[PDB]
Amino acid sequence: SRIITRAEGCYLWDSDGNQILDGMAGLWCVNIGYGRKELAEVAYRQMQELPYYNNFFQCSHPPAIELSRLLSEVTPKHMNHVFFTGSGSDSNDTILRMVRYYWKLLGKPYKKVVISRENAYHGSTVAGASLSGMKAMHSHGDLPIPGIEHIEQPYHFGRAPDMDPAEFGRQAAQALERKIDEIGECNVAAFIAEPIQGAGGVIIPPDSYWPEIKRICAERDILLIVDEVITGFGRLGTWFGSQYYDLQPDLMPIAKGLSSGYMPIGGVMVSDRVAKVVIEEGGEFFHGYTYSGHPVAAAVAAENIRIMRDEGIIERAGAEIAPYLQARWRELGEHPLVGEARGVGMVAALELVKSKQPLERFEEPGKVGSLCRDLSVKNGLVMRAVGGTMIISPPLVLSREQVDELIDKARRTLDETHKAIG
Amino acid sequence: SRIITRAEGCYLWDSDGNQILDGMAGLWCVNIGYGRKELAEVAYRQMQELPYYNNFFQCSHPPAIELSRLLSEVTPKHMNHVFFTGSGSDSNDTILRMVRYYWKLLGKPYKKVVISRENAYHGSTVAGASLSGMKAMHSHGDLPIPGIEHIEQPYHFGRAPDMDPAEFGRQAAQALERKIDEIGECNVAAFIAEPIQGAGGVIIPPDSYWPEIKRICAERDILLIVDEVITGFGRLGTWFGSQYYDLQPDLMPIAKGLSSGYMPIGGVMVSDRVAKVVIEEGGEFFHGYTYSGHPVAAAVAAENIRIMRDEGIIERAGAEIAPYLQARWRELGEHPLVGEARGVGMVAALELVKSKQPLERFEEPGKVGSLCRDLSVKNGLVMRAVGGTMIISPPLVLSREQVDELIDKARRTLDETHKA
Amino acid sequence: TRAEGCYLWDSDGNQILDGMAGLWCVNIGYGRKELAEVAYRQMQELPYYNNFFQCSHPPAIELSRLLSEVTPKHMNHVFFTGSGSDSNDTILRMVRYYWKLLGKPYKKVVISRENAYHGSTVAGASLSGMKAMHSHGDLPIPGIEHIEQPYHFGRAPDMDPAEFGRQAAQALERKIDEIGECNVAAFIAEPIQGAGGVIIPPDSYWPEIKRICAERDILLIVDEVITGFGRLGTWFGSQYYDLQPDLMPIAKGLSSGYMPIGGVMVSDRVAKVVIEEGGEFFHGYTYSGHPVAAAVAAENIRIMRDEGIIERAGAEIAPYLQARWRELGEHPLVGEARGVGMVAALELVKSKQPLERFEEPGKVGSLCRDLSVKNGLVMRAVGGTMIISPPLVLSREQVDELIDKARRTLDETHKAIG
Amino acid sequence: SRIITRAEGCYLWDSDGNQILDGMAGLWCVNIGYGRKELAEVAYRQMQELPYYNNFFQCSHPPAIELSRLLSEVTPKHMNHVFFTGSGSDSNDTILRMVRYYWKLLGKPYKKVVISRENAYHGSTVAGASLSGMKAMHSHGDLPIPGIEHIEQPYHFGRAPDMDPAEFGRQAAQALERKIDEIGECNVAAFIAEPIQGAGGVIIPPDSYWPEIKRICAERDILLIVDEVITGFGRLGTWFGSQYYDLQPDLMPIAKGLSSGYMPIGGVMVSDRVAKVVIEEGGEFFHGYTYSGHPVAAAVAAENIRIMRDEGIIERAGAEIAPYLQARWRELGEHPLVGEARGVGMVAALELVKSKQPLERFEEPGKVGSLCRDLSVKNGLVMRAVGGTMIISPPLVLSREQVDELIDKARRTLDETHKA
């Protein structure tokens, strides 16, 4: 209902001339901010060079290879292969398809089960929507397809506000060992988790969770799938949310920040463990499946990544602005309407609550965040509402002046929300 | 293989200065031909104003809504509603999702099965690869997801060369009625077929098939899902392969030629029937989470469609160069190595056969076509080989002057292979 | 119908290349979507502007800055009006008021040229040398005299061009010493006469005329309606001939034909007098143009300099076009192949070896105009002159198209006449 | 000075959030009121199709022909013929040009004089400014181009406050017969007047006046030209101020409210009389007599006219809100600082005076009106001050609820001035 005339930097100007700070990077994706001519230029060039090449006819300096090199260099040091695709949901299909195929080639075809988390988002294909724990998506059809289970999420504030933050961290990761010993270790092929859940609020694991979950992936013989669709490309202060939590994923769906949202593209990083098996000594994969991603989108994604490592914008993001934003978000932790002030790197969330000292949640808390979102825009700041959780995922080029806009506009938006409610 | 440097029109010049008539529009997709600056311009202009935006906010003359009017005009027989996605494989996911969700809303949740065909291509996601009858993609152990069946394909030349084509046509279309009587009408949600199986050898149904399969879909209460990804946008002489065969799809995935291959986008056309139920009186938008279509990709695709109706290139393809190409492809049917000369509109195929009067196929017939494909690239003509099938999907910009070029490289390419 | 690029598709499904930019105006070509949006946006905000209440970021201010930036040189003031004909009225009106304020109300005469077009209002038609327009009543109004045009082909085909240029530019001093310098307020000329058949001055004319306008005390009015916005390779035909006008009508390419607008660049000399130290705007005062049209026109200039479409026009395709036009000078029907920048003409003649002209050459050219459209090329006819003013986005592949369609059109006409 | 931001209906909101009812129409022109998105829609759609009518050509269904059809049904009776131009000032040039040409074609080139009126506005070109009577414009030089004379205006209040209205009406229109009898009937080609002088104060002729002018224009062989630029399109209660005063103009300039001020355009309506002669038995006004206007401005203008006849806003304006507005305006005539309250249709004026029963006019009365204007905006009402005359030209969308707003802010605005 807003209608946007101009979009440049971290801003959205609206039809009536109102400047709106985009705290959401649109949809977690535009990391270098808007209005980058350098991406529109490389698109124009590649749409004229060759817009769709097959395997019998490659062009000269094809973008699939320019991109492949940059990503093997920017990604963790064990992941040095990539396969492309048309969005970030496609990525979770290929992972499902190939994680199972890895075990078949290792002689254990019974290993085909894939464990997820409740309130986890992994795509919207028929496989992304089954792996995703959003129980609302599962209504449409008998969606959770065979071989997909789901386990507890580490939402300390919403499940168990009183448990020791770190004892809960250990408990909710052992929820994985529980589901392993009920299904059968030899039936489980892998575990997939966002380093942080975007779509469910900014649900951040206690610092204990990921360590225990890595332990379990060793005692039991299973692959790790980290979904860097959102936490990828500077979103957690680091190139990939894996290196924030010292994970060694055996697969990673990527998208969004790959092209800063300027072009549909997704891919999957493939660790060297699983590459020796499915690529060498394996060609039934890539049968019909063809992973020479759309050349125009890989061309943009290449320039997108050059822009971020050469102008050091994600290195500056994690070193200079991420602290200030996180330190100052906590400041909103004292507003009477706010229960938790959550956040890591360049992403953050607020919990909206009826009273704090007894900490009672609202009956219908979505109606409360749904209002606060409508008043953040009406005060010049985009901020999503999952439930009564307010979230921001700003572009990575944000400047400290633009966080003090964000904080002061948030405080105003909370004060207005707090007056209406009582 | 060859390193294409430049590409304009229907030609690809490679590192060595060789002109190569692209008979495969790249991968059945570049319909307005290569080298159309007007599309690269509109992409440049849209990536500058708004490269992407949340659905809460919108653009002023949003690119996706303009596209939607065009698709509701070029062919809206009764299809005046479209949902978009990131590729054409994503598209068949949204159909399976929503075909099941439509019957749920009419009180029949047990109607959830979708019948496909053997050797049909319907995507490469985990649902496209299940719907598709390619037995190689199924190699997985349990790829065909629950609730997907497959039936006989109407490949007259390869299934049953002697049967009368129209009785073989009715035979393969009743394979649909047979599968319904085993599965149970109340379990079947819909049946889906390409109008012509592209990815599987240009396998053209006898003229008897589609008439029957529409009959079965009416007597039985099952939705018809026509896959215009590969046949859509002039490829079949008409705007869409449906109006050529008088179909009334209740869903049509489209892609590849929506944007003439310049930009990842696909969608599903939605007939006014199924639209009444799922859109009004229902909240699933779109597959199950909102996707209004990437503005940059919708911007290209829209201008691409204008270029095609406003310069009338799908009209000229279907009126002047298709008849000519179809007339002349047949001319190759007499060559000693050609059993069938198949073709409709701007798509066509040849079968390679060891002997014709005894009608022998090769043992290992794939080895022969891969050699003939290798000899068209070597003679300046791209030509795909599915099996012992040679196929062409030239762009819609071909000129009558250029079909005579394509025929000659074909006749030239065949003489050599018969000589090996 | 579906006009896109340099092409106009017809009601009958036919592709026609517009070598006329419609009417000397669509410079960024047709089918430019970004201009329709800024119109949509501006019509939504407000439809009027006056001093007692105006909108925010009114386009008149944006356009005024753009027209006083890498567009003119010593002209840093502009006034807007509803067309390019209104523009020559404002100039006529204010040239006289400039002298009134210097104590010289006797200075009110304005010398023009024969076959110069300067508008179609009652004063544009007086300033214009077209004698068909003068019939309507006693049109040539008081003031306004006319002198010889520098049309070397039709006036004096054999004289040395360089001096024929000096002679026709002294026609200005001759008319001054006949009327009286202290009665003359100014001289007005297109840098090139478009509507009169792309009449290109010998390189000598414009040099002399600058001489005369110093020795004699008179203002210079250069009519950049057609030659403005790249038509001559340069932003304005002034900087092609190193002229320094004290007034310039601008229109047409101001908005590439997308929205009615015109203006006047006003040199700093004459602004010190009429603007500072003067009124003039006493309910005339419609110095504010229509906001929607200024908004369209502003985007038009950004697009033209930001994509450098007139810098490329003069540097890359104009030479190709001009050079390739000359090739038609060999055709049996062609005496001269004239042309500068992005504009050019052909003269149709009965024969070349004695240079014989036609009995009724318009009836011959009116025929060729009718056959260029029929072979897919718009080409206007002044008399027996064929003229083209293609949009500035033309591509060399489309000039090779323009030349081939012309040669065919000339060959066909050469068969008919014979 | 007063920055406006959003504008809707009969309202303007400024930078401080103040609602200001526009009692003018900006410049007498916005008739369908502000904020009509449907006008921006048709302009965006036309600028894409054909932004510049080439030559003797057409797009598909050119906008100039539809405008002419609408304008020949809206201005029917004699008329049925129209030209186009870029402003309304350009229009009076085309009239002067062709009125002289009409007589030239009748063998009478000496009939070339055009009689106008003092303090009348007819344009800002050198001919509009010659015809226009206000000497502020003529002082620039010898503006009155040869062949233009001017006569007395029918301003009962300012010329002759005591003469009986009807007798002063006959007295002033015979100023036309006097001037014919001095110049020579055979030199006078036509006489032209606004039905009501807008730009010069809302000077409304006595009811006796226009009857005499029609008398004079018959006995003597001279054409009548009525300037419906300001009074046209509902401004005078009826579609055109002509039919209110039952005039039969042989030419009418139109412009404001042709497009509600959203797009530069004007035209001249041409009676059948002058049409037979300048079209047939002549027509050497080139192919372009003028015509076409501008495809875009014609499209905007066509839509503006549909909105006014399909929603009947000009029929309702004179039938429902106008009677009311004129009746309540009289009320302000009783205020001690107000002498005369004039008004017709959707236009009305007030005279500012020192005392009423001695009838003293102010010395420097514009300074009183300039002050009252600045105080009407200061109290949320636009109201022009031509001299010491206050005038209002509210849009035609005004509501009876909205007239009570205008009277109250007026009475309030008048009280402030009365002690100052």
Numbering used by the authors:
A (entry chain A): 34 to 455
B (entry chain D), D (entry chain C): 34 to 453
C (entry chain B): 38 to 455
Relevant lines from the article:
Herein we present the development of a PluriZyme, TR2E2, with efficient native transaminase (k cat: 69.49±1.77 min−1) and artificial esterase (k cat: 3908–0.41 min−1) activities integrated into a single scaffold, and evaluate its utility in a cascade reaction. The reaction proceeds through the conversion of the β‐keto ester into the β‐keto acid at the hydrolytic site and subsequently into the β‐amino acid (e.e. >99 %) at the transaminase site. In addition, we report the crystal structures of the TR2 enzyme and the newly designed TR2E2 PluriZyme. It presents the typical type I fold of class III ω‐TA observed in known structures present in the PDB database, and it contains the characteristic pyridoxal‐5′‐phosphate (PLP)‐binding domain composed of β‐sheets and the catalytic base Lys289.
Additionally, we succeeded in growing crystals and solving the structure of TR2E2 bound to the PLP cofactor (resolution of 3.5 Å) and in complex with the ethanolamine O‐sulfate (EOS) inhibitor (resolution of 3.6 Å), located in the transaminase catalytic center. The artificial esterase catalytic triad was observed in the TR2E2 crystal structures and is composed of Ser172 and His173 of chain A (magenta) and Glu317 of chain B (green); similar to the transaminase's active site, the esterase site is composed of a functional protein dimer. Notably, the distance between both active sites is ≈20 Å, with the esterase site being more solvent‐exposed and located at the beginning of the tunnel and the transaminase site being more buried in the protein structure. When the residues Ser172 and His173 were replaced with Ala, the activity was completely abolished. Thus, the A172S and Q173H mutations in TR2E2 (located at site G in Figure 2) do not exert a deleterious effect on the original transaminase activity and, importantly, confer esterase activity.
